[PDB]
Design a protein around this ligand. Structure first.
Ligand SMILES: *[C@H](C)[C@H]1/C(=C/c2[nH]c(/C=C3N=C(/C=C4\NC(=O)C(CC)=C4C)C(C)=C\3CCC(=O)O)c(CCC(=O)O)c2C)NC(=O)[C@@H]1C
Ligand SMILES: CCC1=C(C)/C(=C/C2=NC(=C\c3[nH]c(/C=C4\NC(=O)[C@H](C)[C@H]4CC)c(C)c3CCC(=O)O)/C(CCC(=O)O)=C2C)NC1=O
Ligand SMILES: CCC1=C(C)/C(=C/C2=NC(=C\c3[nH]c(/C=C4\NC(=O)[C@H](C)[C@H]4CC)c(C)c3CCC(=O)O)/C(CCC(=O)O)=C2C)NC1=O
Ligand SMILES: CCC1=C(C)/C(=C/C2=NC(=C\c3[nH]c(/C=C4\NC(=O)[C@H](C)[C@H]4CC)c(C)c3CCC(=O)O)/C(CCC(=O)O)=C2C)NC1=O
Ligand SMILES: CCC1=C(C)/C(=C/C2=NC(=C\c3[nH]c(/C=C4\NC(=O)[C@H](C)[C@H]4CC)c(C)c3CCC(=O)O)/C(CCC(=O)O)=C2C)NC1=O
Ligand SMILES: CCC1=C(C)/C(=C/C2=NC(=C\c3[nH]c(/C=C4\NC(=O)[C@H](C)[C@H]4CC)c(C)c3CCC(=O)O)/C(CCC(=O)O)=C2C)NC1=O
Ligand SMILES: CCC1=C(C)/C(=C/C2=NC(=C\c3[nH]c(/C=C4\NC(=O)[C@H](C)[C@H]4CC)c(C)c3CCC(=O)O)/C(CCC(=O)O)=C2C)NC1=O
Ligand SMILES: CCC1=C(C)/C(=C/C2=NC(=C\c3[nH]c(/C=C4\NC(=O)[C@H](C)[C@H]4CC)c(C)c3CCC(=O)O)/C(CCC(=O)O)=C2C)NC1=O
Ligand SMILES: CCC1=C(C)/C(=C/C2=NC(=C\c3[nH]c(/C=C4\NC(=O)[C@H](C)[C@H]4CC)c(C)c3CCC(=O)O)/C(CCC(=O)O)=C2C)NC1=O
Ligand SMILES: CCC1=C(C)/C(=C/C2=NC(=C\c3[nH]c(/C=C4\NC(=O)[C@H](C)[C@H]4CC)c(C)c3CCC(=O)O)/C(CCC(=O)O)=C2C)NC1=O
Ligand SMILES: CCC1=C(C)/C(=C/C2=NC(=C\c3[nH]c(/C=C4\NC(=O)[C@H](C)[C@H]4CC)c(C)c3CCC(=O)O)/C(CCC(=O)O)=C2C)NC1=O
Lengths: 98, 249, 159, 172, 162, 159, 173, 159, 159
């Protein structure tokens, strides 16, 4: 939600060298950028899990939760598997890939 | 206008006779005399050593030298005592010493250079500091060279020198042309980084570094206030006689 | 003084009555004299704290005495710092034109503070009286009157 | 001895750059206000002797033990001593308004003043009660307009009075 | 340091008297000329970088051996040419300093005091610097009475050189 | 280092794996040597800033030169205050055992701060290198290694 | 005071009040042979006296370059000439010390009150002794010369000369 | 500047909006003045590198000093070759009308290159400032403004 | 430390030990820093004595109570003179390295003396502790360890 370089100048310079080439695509790059130590310090560590779900809906899907059933299922998923399970269940979806 | 306040003179080296002429060491200075001419090397040495006392060697330079007063000295039109007045009442000396130093320190620096003695106490420096203020600096330099301690010891035709410093540091060397209180204003201790290191841990920086608040900021004000309170009363509490102490109506 | 009239007309449902507008216009006119008085008290602060400590420790020597609170250099420095604080609040009240921003910071809970610090309040009142006398000597007649106004408020408040 | 013109040189030498254009616009206002500065200076020196005794009608009337037997202004030489250097305050304050910067005043007038005034035994604080009485009479003369074209010299009046306040701070 | 306002003070201070109309009159004269002197300061400050490299390559013309002879003093090496623009660039600073002061004081205290001592030791011939200053006084592009104003202090540094 | 393992096992849904418990037990064992190293760097702060300013202004004289930033007594005092800040953060990182509470206060946005202050960052890196050399002279071998650890992190961070 | 090798072995011998022993006279006899070598050696310093000072000033100011840059205490031109005059006065009294053969004439002029003025003025005192060492590196390079002089062992004499500079750097720094 | 508008309208699914067509038509009109400015900077290159080295080594003598990077004839030749490179990229940016083909070759990774070469970047910025001053003396007013545009971009980029 | 080493080797029949000669060499090497500490304490005589005495009267008001010994201006002046004497002996001990000057001038018979004077010993000791704290705040840190440890000998030997 704000550019981490030009503003703080700290970022992963490891993954840019693969996205510039074409080793991992953007759906792979967003996945490898979310389950990262950089994203956890700003969005997974301040907020409760129910707010983390909505912020990871905004960061990846670009929208807010549409129904009660949606947050029930995604809370169960983040509950049983941490943040990388939520990132994997969010990046792989039908709403993302369409 | 007003006469000098009486000041106490401390005991120094030069108030003493020091008998004899053939007995003093080598290290008494060469008492260069315009009456001894015999050559131009003596003429140039008399000019150069008269600059030595006045400008402490390093300054003589080229520009500071007043060439017309040295033009005159060779001719003999003006005495050496008149010639030191030309060097001392010169604004090439004013910018060098007089503006830069203080009226209390100027008394100390011009007695070592024109009379060749350090001031006895601070009361002597206090005494002449008034004579500087109302008559001006050249009025005071006139009063030093008119003074009878000058004419008795040096005379009309002898360049000054330190009288009897048997075991003392040389006066052009122990005293600069400006002291430490003025040092920030003429010197460059502000911009040199070597001194700001010393300053960083100085007790004066810790009074500056504290934020607004603390009574250590007002600790210098608390010493100037004074007015300490009286002690408790000596008289014993028991006698007081409290039952008959109350006044009716 | 504008907040005073605003909350005064604000407790009522009415607007600001134009007599209050007249008093605001007159305060706006006198603000330049207020600013000059405040700057004159501003630049000469350490003289005023020096003469206040002078007149106080000449008047009451028990703070100097070791049973009193202001014994030693640290405690007497804290004492003159308190007098500096009160001079600062007096300059604030001189600019604001009404004693609200000085009572809000120096008056409203001062008795229990000085009671649980051990210091007597009458000596603080005598210190502000000494500040008023020194500022009366520092200023002109119409300036010393208008400064002794707020100094008088502080002296009445500390008692 | 420094100035307004020379002090903005001396810090500009210490940084070693050319003088900026807004420093020259600052000095252009100093030249512009120069005529006003000169007028104020001449009125002080023409009423210089009238100020000192009129300050001495209150410096001694307010603290009357000073000339009473025992005080340090008692005998006649001692009395002429605090008129021989009451005017030296005016001799160097007028040099400060002429130069426009208090650096001339600090070097001679107040550098060693507070040291002698405890060495002699004179009350140091009893000077700055009357230097304030000089300032009350100095800015009363410098502001009053007599046979003068109307002008506003208010800025000078406040920093003329700042030189007296510096003259009272280092003695008290 | 030497200034017409200072020269009024140091004259009246050594007499122990007040400021007469004769010291005060001197100050009045300075203002008329100080209005045209600050015109000369902006003319040299704005054209400063053109004038320095205009000068340090003019001295290389009249003295071509100074870029050829291998010596510490000589400017033939790059290090000399780095110290070339430092030294000539020091001159335009002090000339602009003595312009706004009105006197020769900053020129007398920063530049020419003890210049005969330093040029003898480092073997810097003073004929070099006087050739640069003749280029400055002819190529500053200043006009009117301000053109007279910079022309005194440049020529005052010339006479102190020789 | 406990917050590191806790958020590390907290991103996962698993507990703290007992190898992480072993590293916490080992850090708990080494904490006494960490505290002695931090106190030795604590009490000798004046010396380290002096020798760091020494070696820096001998190494790079442009901060001394008037075109540089640290020209004059005020700017050179701010420079040695910056070196004091970095020594303080190094002692924090020595106690904490991992570079998080020192990077959070001194590293994470330092390049744009020093860019919009005008100062070069390489001179700051040379200053922390001088601090590392002076602390290497002050400490024993196993202490200077473990101090030059975090000093090395700061030197790599400022570049 | 002005003392010598010849006069200092008198002055302690006066304080004990005895006649001069024969091994003190054999010590002073060694000195006479040494003196001829020294005169030749000390003449080389004074003939290259002005060449040393600027060649030390090509490094005294190049190594600490803020000193002549605006702000340093060697910045303006009389301040720059101030240093040179003093720099040679080190050579003016070190050459007096090698002539006398004892540093008792050195310690009254360069070592007596010099460290007091150098904090009163505001000059860096430690920035002198970086370049007096650069004088010593050039002084013993000239004195120890294989050209124009019949080879004689001057190593014994050289050591005394080198030290006088170290005494000249110790009381300033 | 055409690639800028094309990728700008290409991220969107819309066509090129006709205001962008107006800016392309205006750039097409100004291209002749751009070509004359580029040829004037082209034919006079060695003068500009000479005066830039002049003003830089007069401004910063540490590259001349043996501790600096540009010490000796080989290193100073590499220094003037770097200034030649930057003048060449400035002419490219003058023709292209927008700073993309000059930032792509000279700006985008320059800080880490000059950091791992040892050279300071501020001296390079002063060198491009000297190039801007010399080209401002070489050109007319409306030409020096439009050249100092891209020179100004390089000076801001190297800092 | 030379007198103590000589009398200790005098009690035995043998010369001075190599260990003891190392002690004398290290004492000579630290002697210049000890003269610097003596310089600071000589020049801070007034304010150190006054701050320590007023800290004592803040801690112990029994002496300046009217039943106490230091009641009155003359008695409290002699109190401050006693603190002056002890600070002088502390400077002697810092210079010598022994505590034999402190001991045989002011320690050896002080209990019987202050018993016959009516003065409490513990208040003397608290005043010397206040001197230790004040001189610890004035000096450099491990230099203050050096000064305060001689102060610590005086404090422990008075009680
Ligand atoms: C030189 C490497 C540094 C330096 C020199 C410098 N010194 C002064 C001022 C003085 N120097 C002395 C020195 C001596 N006086 C003595 O009698 C002797 C022994 C015979 C010595 C060595 C003294 C007394 C002064 C005071 C003034 C005087 O010249 O008489 C200056 C001028 C500084 C000033 O005018 O304020 C300079 C430049 N300073 C440096 O910058 C170099 C680091
Ligand atoms: C961890 C293992 C690993 C490596 C090595 C790696 C290399 C790598 N090097 C690249 C480019 C490059 N690599 C080089 C390197 C070189 N060319 C030369 O002339 C030299 C011989 C050599 C340097 C020693 C250069 C010059 C480019 C730039 C090509 C370009 O981006 O236009 C690219 C293209 C995109 C990018 O840099 O960001 C990749 C992915 N990726 C990896 O994940
Ligand atoms: C008017 C007040 C006053 C006094 C007293 C005074 C003393 C004075 N005594 C001196 C020397 C001296 N004074 C003595 C004195 C003594 N030797 C002994 O054994 C005795 C105990 C003692 C005399 C009773 C000696 C031996 C010297 C010469 C020391 C030397 O040159 O090393 C000197 C230095 C040389 C000189 O005489 O000029 C002065 C200035 N000056 C004054 O203005
Ligand atoms: C701006 C509003 C404001 C007020 C009013 C204020 C009072 C104030 N006075 C204090 C102490 C003190 N105040 C005094 C006061 C005095 N000396 C005397 O004898 C007289 C009775 C009086 C002044 C002449 C003394 C002696 C202390 C130190 C008492 C102690 O240390 O226990 C303290 C505690 C120490 C401190 O943090 O400064 C506070 C907070 N602080 C504030 O921020
Ligand atoms: C240029 C700056 C300058 C000043 C101001 C100055 C003052 C000064 N005033 C002095 C004495 C004096 N100062 C005074 C002044 C006063 N005493 C009083 O009773 C009054 C309260 C007060 C005047 C308001 C008097 C009466 C004396 C003579 C005292 C004596 O002779 O013991 C003295 C010592 C003796 C002297 O030479 O006359 C100095 C040095 N000196 C300086 O160089
Ligand atoms: C050195 C000898 C000398 C003096 C004394 C001098 C004074 C002087 N003051 C002037 C103006 C003036 N002077 C004042 C001064 C003031 N007006 C006020 O109401 C204030 C109270 C006061 C300042 C505190 C004013 C207001 C003017 C108006 C004209 C101007 O701005 O110069 C002018 C303008 C030209 C003229 O009057 O003919 C002169 C001559 N000029 C000289 O050559
Ligand atoms: C603030 C006023 C000021 C100026 C201007 C100044 C100049 C000055 N230039 C010097 C040397 C020098 N000056 C130059 C300059 C030149 N030589 C040439 O070959 C060229 C012809 C010419 C330049 C156009 C050079 C190359 C040196 C070094 C010479 C040497 O080291 O022997 C020196 C002696 C050594 C030094 O500290 O660097 C001084 C004092 N000093 C001052 O305080
Ligand atoms: C604890 C985290 C922390 C950091 C890192 C920090 C940096 C910091 N450095 C500053 C200034 C400064 N920093 C320096 C730095 C240097 N001198 C040099 O030449 C070198 C490049 C470098 C040190 C050796 C200088 C010269 C200034 C003053 C610059 C100015 O006044 O514009 C300032 C502004 C003035 C101030 O408020 O202190 C900040 C905030 N502050 C912090 O709280
Ligand atoms: C005061 C005027 C004066 C001088 C200058 C002087 C010097 C002088 N040096 C001499 C010898 C000598 N001088 C030296 C000196 C040295 N050889 C080395 O290789 C060393 C590097 C160096 C000493 C550091 C030597 C080795 C001799 C050989 C002869 C001898 O022992 O005197 C001699 C012997 C007689 C002669 O040469 O005719 C003279 C004259 N004599 C004088 O009357
Ligand atoms: C067109 C894009 C482009 C850039 C930007 C570039 C920079 C560049 N600068 C270099 C060296 C260099 N660059 C400089 C730079 C400077 N001298 C100084 O003092 C200043 C700080 C600065 C210029 C005024 C120096 C001194 C070297 C030689 C450094 C060395 O040999 O280690 C080198 C290595 C040597 C070489 O192969 O030329 C490269 C690649 N090359 C490119 O192709
Ligand atoms: C160098 C070693 C040395 C010491 C220590 C010393 C102490 C000393 N303390 C004295 C009195 C005194 N000493 C104190 C002391 C104190 N008030 C207290 O309550 C505190 C505990 C203590 C302050 C530390 C008082 C109150 C008196 C006056 C008692 C009297 O006059 O009867 C006296 C008698 C009057 C005098 O000659 O000054 C001596 C000799 N003399 C020495 O030569």
């Amino acid at each position: 939600e704000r550019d981490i370089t030009r503003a703080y100048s700290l970022s992963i310079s490891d993954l840019e060298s693969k996205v510039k080439n074409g080793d991992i695509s953007m759906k792979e790059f967003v996945r490898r950028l979310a389950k990262s130590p950089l994203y956890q310090k700003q969005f997974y560590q301040p907020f409760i899990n129910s707010r983390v779900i909505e912020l990871a809906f905004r960061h990846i899907l670009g929208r807010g939760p549409s129904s009660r059933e949606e947050v029930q299922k995604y809370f169960s998923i983040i509950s049983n598997g941490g943040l990388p399970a939520l990132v994997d269940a969010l990046v792989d979806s039908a709403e993302y890939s369409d | 206008a007003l006469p000098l306040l009486q000041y106490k003179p401390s005991s120094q080296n030069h108030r003493v006779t020091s008998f004899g002429a053939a007995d003093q060491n080598e290290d008494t200075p060469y008492i260069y005399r315009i009456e001894d001419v015999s050559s131009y090397t003596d003429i140039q040495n008399i000019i150069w050593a008269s600059y030595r006392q006045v400008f402490s060697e390093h300054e003589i330079l080229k520009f500071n030298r007043q060439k017309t007063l040295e033009s005159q000295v060779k001719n003999g039109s003006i005495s050496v005592r008149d010639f030191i007045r030309g060097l001392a009442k010169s604004e090439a000396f004013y910018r060098l010493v007089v503006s830069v130093n203080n009226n209390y320190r100027l008394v100390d620096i011009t007695l070592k250079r024109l009379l060749g003695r350090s001031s006895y106490n601070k009361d002597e420096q206090i005494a002449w500091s008034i004579v500087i203020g109302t008559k001006g600096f050249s009025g005071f330099v006139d009063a030093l060279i008119d003074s009878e301690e000058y004419t008795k010891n040096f005379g009309e035709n002898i360049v000054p020198y330190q009288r009897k410093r048997m075991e003392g540091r040389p006066h052009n060397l122990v005293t600069p042309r400006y002291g430490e209180d003025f040092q920030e204003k003429a010197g460059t201790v502000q911009t040199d980084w070597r001194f700001t290191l010393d300053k960083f841990y100085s007790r004066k920086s810790q009074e500056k570094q504290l934020r607004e608040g603390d009574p250590r900021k007002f600790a210098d004000l608390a010493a100037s206030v004074g007015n300490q309170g009286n002690y408790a009363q000596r008289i014993s509490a028991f006698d007081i006689d409290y039952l008959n102490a109350v006044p009716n109506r | 003084i504008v907040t005073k009239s605003i909350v005064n007309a604000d407790a009522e449902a009415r607007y600001l009555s134009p007599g209050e507008l007249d008093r605001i216009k007159s305060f706006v006119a006198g603000g330049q004299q207020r600013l000059r008085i405040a700057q004159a008290l501003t630049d000469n602060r350490e003289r005023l704290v020096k003469q206040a400590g002078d007149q106080l420790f000449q008047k009451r020597p028990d703070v100097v005495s070791p049973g009193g609170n202001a014994y030693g250099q640290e405690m007497t420095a804290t004492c003159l710092r308190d007098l500096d604080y009160y001079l600062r609040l007096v300059t604030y009240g001189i600019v604001a034109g009404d004693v609200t921003p000085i009572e809000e910071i120096g008056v409203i809970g001062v008795r229990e503070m000085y009671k649980s610090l051990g210091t007597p309040i009458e000596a603080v009142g005598e210190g502000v009286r000494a500040l008023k006398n020194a500022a009366s000597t520092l200023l002109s007649a119409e300036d010393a009157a208008e400064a002794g106004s707020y100094f008088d408020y502080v002296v009445g408040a500390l008692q | 001895t420094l100035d307004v013109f020379t002090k903005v040189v001396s810090q500009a030498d210490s940084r070693g750059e050319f003088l900026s254009n807004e420093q020259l616009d600052a000095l252009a206002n100093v030249v512009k206000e120069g005529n006003k500065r000169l007028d104020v200076v001449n009125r002080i020196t023409s009423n210089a002797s009238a100020i000192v005794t009129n300050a001495a009608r209150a410096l001694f009337e307010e603290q009357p033990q000073l000339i009473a037997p025992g005080g340090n202004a008692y005998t006649n030489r001692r009395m002429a001593a605090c008129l021989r250097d009451m005017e030296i305050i005016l001799r160097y304050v007028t040099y400060a308004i002429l130069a426009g910067d208090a650096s001339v005043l600090d070097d001679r007038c107040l550098n060693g003043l507070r040291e002698t005034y405890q060495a002699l035994g004179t009350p140091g604080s009893s000077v700055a009660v009357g230097v304030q009485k000089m300032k009350d009479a100095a800015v009363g003369i410098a502001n009053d307009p007599n046979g003068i074209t109307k002008g506003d010299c208010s800025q000078l009046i406040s920093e003329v009075a700042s030189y007296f306040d510096r003259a009272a701070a280092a003695v008290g | 340091v030497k200034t017409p306002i200072t020269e009024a003070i140091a004259a009246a201070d050594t007499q122990g008297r007040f400021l007469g109309n004769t010291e005060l009159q001197s100050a009045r004269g300075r203002y008329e000329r100080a209005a045209a002197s600050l015109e000369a300061a902006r003319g040299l400050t704005s054209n400063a970088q053109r004038l320095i490299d205009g000068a340090t390559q003019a001295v290389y013309q009249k003295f071509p051996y100074t870029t050829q002879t291998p010596g510490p003093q000589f400017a033939a090496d790059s290090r000399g040419k780095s110290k070339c623009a430092r030294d000539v660039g020091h001159y335009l600073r002090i000339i602009t300093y003595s312009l706004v002061a009105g006197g020769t004081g900053p020129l007398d205290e920063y530049l020419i005091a003890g210049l005969a001592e330093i040029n003898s030791t480092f073997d810097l011939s003073p004929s070099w610097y006087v050739e640069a200053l003749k280029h400055i006084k002819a190529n500053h592009g200043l006009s009117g009475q301000a053109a007279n104003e910079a022309n005194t202090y440049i020529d005052y540094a010339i006479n102190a050189l020789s």
